[PDB]
Design a protein around this ligand. Structure first.
Ligand SMILES: CCCCCCCCCCCCCCCCCC(=O)OC[C@H](COP(=O)([O-])OC[C@H](O)COP(=O)([O-])OC[C@H](COC(=O)CCCCCCCCCCCCCCCCC)OC(=O)CCCCCCCCCCCCCCCCC)OC(=O)CCCCCCCCCCCCCCCCC
Lengths: 63, 171
């Protein structure tokens, strides 16, 4: 191979691998913040569906 | 937390309906026919406010309209009503079916002297509409502010940048 070909191929490899490394560090930080705060789409552990609640007039009024 | 707000004992004074349960059961159908409007105003206020402290005055109107019901029996038809609730009062389950002739005499005397029609089977169990002037409770559960939901997903789904990014895997 030419030194041009190997050199610029190496630079393509370095760009791909550095972008993957920055995204892995961001993935760690995103998982840390989402487990800490719970306001993202991940770690959304379920609560009770409020579509199950009966809203009719009941037998006794104080409810 | 805060102090609960109880009304005074003067706000709870009213002329009580001091009759027994067989007196009430004997007069029950005519009570539902004649004392309809303040009873249904009170029970509408009672299921809407979900607080008896917001329902005292209408309740007093119930205790005002029951007594005027009984006086209007006591003036005109005390004998068939007494003879009917005594027979209702004999039974341990207080059956209407044991007392049909005293019921017929009480209904005859009431329809002649007062014009009240006894409600048919099905009528007192109807769901009726009530026209009140008190406002609708906007927060009857006294609920505070609800938390804002998490932000939803939006945007078209692009492929994963450089695939899985798992250690050496390129896809
Ligand atoms: C017009 C429309 C049609 C167009 C058609 C165009 C194509 C025409 C040709 C058609 C055929 C195409 C074949 C697929 C494309 C080439 C894939 C390839 O070579 O990847 C190189 C792959 C990555 O190297 P690369 O230089 O970075 O990428 C070159 C390309 O860009 C690779 O491209 P990439 O970057 O996109 O690849 C994605 C990713 C690239 O890889 C990665 O990102 C890294 C992770 C790879 C896996 C590493 C696992 C390590 C731990 C387990 C090791 C197991 C033991 C090793 C083998 C033991 C003996 C069986 O692949 C994977 O992760 C998949 C796993 C590897 C499977 C490769 C295909 C195998 C098919 C045949 C299987 C036969 C047995 C093979 C041996 C079994 C093990 C694979 O090399 C290796 O991982 C080394 C091992 C070799 C893999 C198999 C090579 C395929 C040919 C086998 C022929 C000989 C068989 C002999 C008999 C049976 C065995 C005794």
């Amino acid at each position: 191979d030419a030194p041009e070909k190997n050199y610029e191929r190496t630079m393509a490899i370095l760009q791909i691998e550095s972008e993957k490394a920055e995204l892995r560090l961001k993935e760690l930080e995103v998982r840390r913040l989402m487990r800490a705060k719970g306001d993202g789409p991940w770690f959304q552990y379920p609560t009770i569906d409020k579509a199950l609640i009966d809203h009719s007039p009941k037998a006794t009024p104080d409810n | 937390p805060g102090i609960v707000e109880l009304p005074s004992l003067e706000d709870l004074k009213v002329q009580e309906v001091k009759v027994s349960s067989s007196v009430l059961k004997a007069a029950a159908h005519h009570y539902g026919a004649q004392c309809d409007k303040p009873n249904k105003e009170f029970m509408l206020c009672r299921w809407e406010e979900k607080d008896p402290r917001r329902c005292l005055e209408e309740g007093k109107l119930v205790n005002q309209c029951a007594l005027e019901f009984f006086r209007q029996i006591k003036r005109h038809c005390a004998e068939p009503f007494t003879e009917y609730w005594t027979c209702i009062d004999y039974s341990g389950l207080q059956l209407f079916r044991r007392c049909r002739k005293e019921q017929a005499q009480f209904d005859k005397c009431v329809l002649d002297k007062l014009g009240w029609v006894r409600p048919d089977l099905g009528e007192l169990s109807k769901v009726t509409k009530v026209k009140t002037d008190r406002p609708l409770p906007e927060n009857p559960y006294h609920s505070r502010a609800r938390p804002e939901p998490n932000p939803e997903v939006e945007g078209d789904l692009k492929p994963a940048r450089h695939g899985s990014r798992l250690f050496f895997w390129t896809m």
